[PDB]
């Protein structure tokens, strides 16, 4: 009743938001486990300033804000940030000062602040990487040298993958006085999320609805969940397992876009035990967030 | 002694202090990190840190008594994560991330210890704890829970004169000095040998 | 109303879009999908570049254009970009630089244009790729050596496939002050892209109308597609059940995509019962497209 786990995945498409550089100018994609196999991954704060994009698409107050500046990369300091701050800061974002300004702000409120509240992990593409790329660039030189770019044009490679990828992510419910308004935002932006990525120019995919399952236990953050689905998509095996022997109560599950496999006969079992009667994913946050919720 | 309890996590970090523009991991958690987690999992308030910004002080008369075997049989391999960073402003600077690690933590203490774990599976009126050990930053952290006792054998390392430095006693203003454990490889074995239970003043 | 998606498939045809290179005389061709088969793609720069081309088929004010010269790469500029220019910089691309002169040209405009105001992705062949190709060749020599080539007469090969393939779009509604007036003129360029490869001479194909699937909504973003068709082209089997229940069950609403040419199939009854909640009324996407840029515009 004080905490909430769940996985997120997505439909296939091609790959994006590169970090590495190289020597000789191919773009490359992360890579981390060494098995025999690669895979693209993605860092949670990329993910963490979209969602702060889209808290600042709604209406919600907050002291930080990406400013489109001078080639070194700048963040708007604005006002002192405030714990009661009505959307951003009460949410998350850690401040640390080196001064600690003057007599800890004046005495007030608290100096270091404490992001908790809202965890997140990696993403792993669950398909392995492959050696294929293409070369598309193909620059320009001008031809009235008015503002030239770089003399000569050049030829490099671009690679890209045909995956899809998950994350999980986590939250505890402890506050409920002012918490539960900015709570129902950030559900319904988590429930609908784009970007997290630089080029989109190229390379446009979008992640929010797939098959998602969430579990509200008082558990104090133990999971039986391995957070791996399949490549093809039918993880359902993990619940095989458990929900036959219902050792995960009755009520330990929840359903998303996979429900709408053909075969029925074993939901109906399961809808006397589990309460997954959802097949739009947008509907599920609507619910469940009232029950995770004290009213 | 009397009971080890064994947890895994999908990925993990534990970074040395004074990194610099390279931050490093070890294999293993550190004796005080490890501490700390656990420490964390019963509930406590921050003392060790004695941070800058709030005064939270470790009062001297604390006695945790705790003697902890661990060590990595498993490999795991690490690799790069390209990233940047606002703290130095913005520049740019990479690190490190462990892919997994392994499962063989042992812990002593006096009985008080098992009330909290065995109420863990059952929580009322739970409190956030303060000091996240090892590691100050937050989003790295997951746990999990096996009573199983004496399978799954792996080695423990003792310390003689592998892992070439560990943190001891959580310093923050100075160095602790504590040192390496230099416990480096230890032996197949299915039960520690004495030599690795040790005693962590905090 | 603030955004607008959509994915465009086309005819079956050979295409031939020589693309790599290789010493061993073949012009291959570029594979991005592991499925066990191979699958033929189109960069989106080549899409962008028709665009333009044909935004200046069009009477549209421009600072960029392609000349031939020496045999660098090289376009004309014309010129500075500006934010507030008519057809090319505003809609899309954006002003690198070096040295920025001074003082950003005296705080005229920005020289960061934040990305192009439309959005897309590679094509996708949606057929397998087949080892097939053509002795299409044999290079001569010259008779009487005035302006001669190379001096031998070689031989190579090429290869063709025959496909049809699609790919996805998409944009948000920002600005309505400037933007209607070069939005309609995208959106009819859309309608009709010719070229977007490098042989037209020899294996010509157009590929504007097959199909279209778009939707607008003030949803910020969500697709319900998976941007995938079948061979037969139609998609609506797993969709058939989420058109309906417009008014209840918290399905994707009635006025929430539109029509296109697989309309046109042979059953009319089910047409008929789709017709009660959704748009799917326009067989022409031409057509289609003169009204769904009104109803997304302003006006």
Same mark, same amino acid.
């Given at each position: 009743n004080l905490n909430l786990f769940a996985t997120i995945l997505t439909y296939p498409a091609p790959a994006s938001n590169y970090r590495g550089e190289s020597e000789e100018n191919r773009s490359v994609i992360q890579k981390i486990l060494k098995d025999g196999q690669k895979y693209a991954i993605i860092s949670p704060e990329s993910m963490r300033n979209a969602l702060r994009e889209m808290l600042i698409e709604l209406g919600q107050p907050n002291n930080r804000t990406r400013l489109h500046?001078?080639?070194?990369?700048?963040?708007?300091?604005?006002?002192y940030?405030?714990?009661?701050?009505?959307?951003?800061?009460?949410?998350? @974002?850690?401040?640390?000062?080196?001064?600690?300004?003057?007599?800890?702000?004046?005495?007030?409120?608290?100096?270091? =602040?404490?992001?908790?509240?809202?965890?997140?992990?990696?993403?792993?593409?669950?398909?392995?990487?492959?050696?294929?790329?293409?070369?598309?660039?193909?620059?320009?030189?001008?031809?009235?040298?008015?503002?030239?770019?770089?003399?000569?044009?050049?030829?490099?490679?671009?690679?890209?993958?045909?995956?899809?990828?998950?994350?999980?992510?986590?939250?505890? @419910? =402890?506050?409920?006085?002012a918490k539960p308004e900015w709570v129902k935002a950030l559900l319904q932006a988590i429930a609908e999320?784009?970007?997290?990525?630089?080029?989109?120019?190229?390379?446009?995919?979008?992640?929010?609805?797939?098959?998602?399952?969430?579990?509200?236990?008082?558990?104090?953050?133990? @999971?039986?969940?391995?957070? @791996?689905?399949?490549?093809?998509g039918n993880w359902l095996e993990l619940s095989r397992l458990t929900a036959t022997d219902s050792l995960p109560a009755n009520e330990f599950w929840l359903g998303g876009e996979l429900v709408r496999k053909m075969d029925q006969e074993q939901k109906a079992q399961l809808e006397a035990m589990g309460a997954h009667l959802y097949a739009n994913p947008e509907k599920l946050f609507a619910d469940l967030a009232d029950s995770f919720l004290g009213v | 002694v009397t009971r080890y309890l064994r947890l895994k996590a999908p990925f993990a970090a534990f970074r040395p202090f004074q990194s610099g523009s390279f931050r490093s991991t070890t294999p293993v958690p550190s004796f005080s990190a490890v501490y700390g987690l656990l420490l964390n999992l019963a509930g406590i308030e921050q003392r060790q840190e004695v941070e800058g910004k709030v005064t939270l002080i470790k009062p001297k008369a604390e006695? &945790?008594?705790?003697?902890?075997?661990?060590?990595?049989?498993?490999?795991?391999?690490?690799?790069?994560?390209?990233?940047?960073?606002?703290?130095?402003?913005?520049?740019?600077?990479?690190?490190?991330?462990?892919?997994?690690?392994?499962?063989?933590?042992?812990?002593?203490? &006096?009985?008080?210890?098992w009330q909290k774990l065995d109420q863990g599976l059952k929580g009322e009126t739970v409190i956030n704890r303060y000091?996240?050990?090892?590691?100050?930053?937050?989003?790295?952290?997951?746990?999990?829970?096996? &009573?199983?006792?004496k399978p799954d054998l792996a080695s423990w390392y003792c310390p003689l004169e592998g892992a070439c430095r560990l943190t001891l006693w959580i310093d923050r203003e100075n160095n602790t000095q504590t040192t390496i454990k230099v416990f480096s490889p230890s032996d197949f074995r299915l039960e520690p040998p004495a030599k690795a239970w040790q005693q962590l003043p905090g």
């Open positions: 500046s001078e080639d070194q990369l700048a963040v708007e300091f604005k006002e940030p405030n714990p009661d701050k009505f959307a951003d800061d009460f949410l998350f @974002g850690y401040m640390v000062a080196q001064t600690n300004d003057a007599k800890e702000m004046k005495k007030l409120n608290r100096p270091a =602040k404490r992001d908790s509240i809202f965890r997140c992990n990696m993403a792993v593409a669950v398909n392995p990487y492959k050696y294929d790329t293409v070369f598309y660039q193909s620059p320009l030189n001008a031809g009235d040298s008015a503002w030239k770019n770089s003399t000569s044009s050049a030829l490099l490679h671009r690679e890209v993958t045909h995956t899809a990828f998950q994350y999980p992510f986590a939250l505890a @419910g =402890k506050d409920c006085a999320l784009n970007g997290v990525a630089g080029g989109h120019a190229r390379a446009y995919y979008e992640f929010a609805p797939r098959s998602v399952v969430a579990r509200l236990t008082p558990k104090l953050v133990a @999971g039986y969940q391995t957070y @791996g689905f399949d490549a093809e | 006695l &945790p008594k705790l003697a902890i075997a661990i060590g990595q049989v498993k490999p795991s391999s690490t690799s790069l994560i390209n990233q940047q960073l606002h703290n130095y402003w913005i520049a740019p600077v990479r690190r490190e991330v462990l892919v997994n690690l392994d499962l063989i933590i042992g812990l002593q203490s &006096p009985v008080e210890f000091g996240l050990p090892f590691a100050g930053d937050n989003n790295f952290l997951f746990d999990e829970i096996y &009573p199983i006792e």
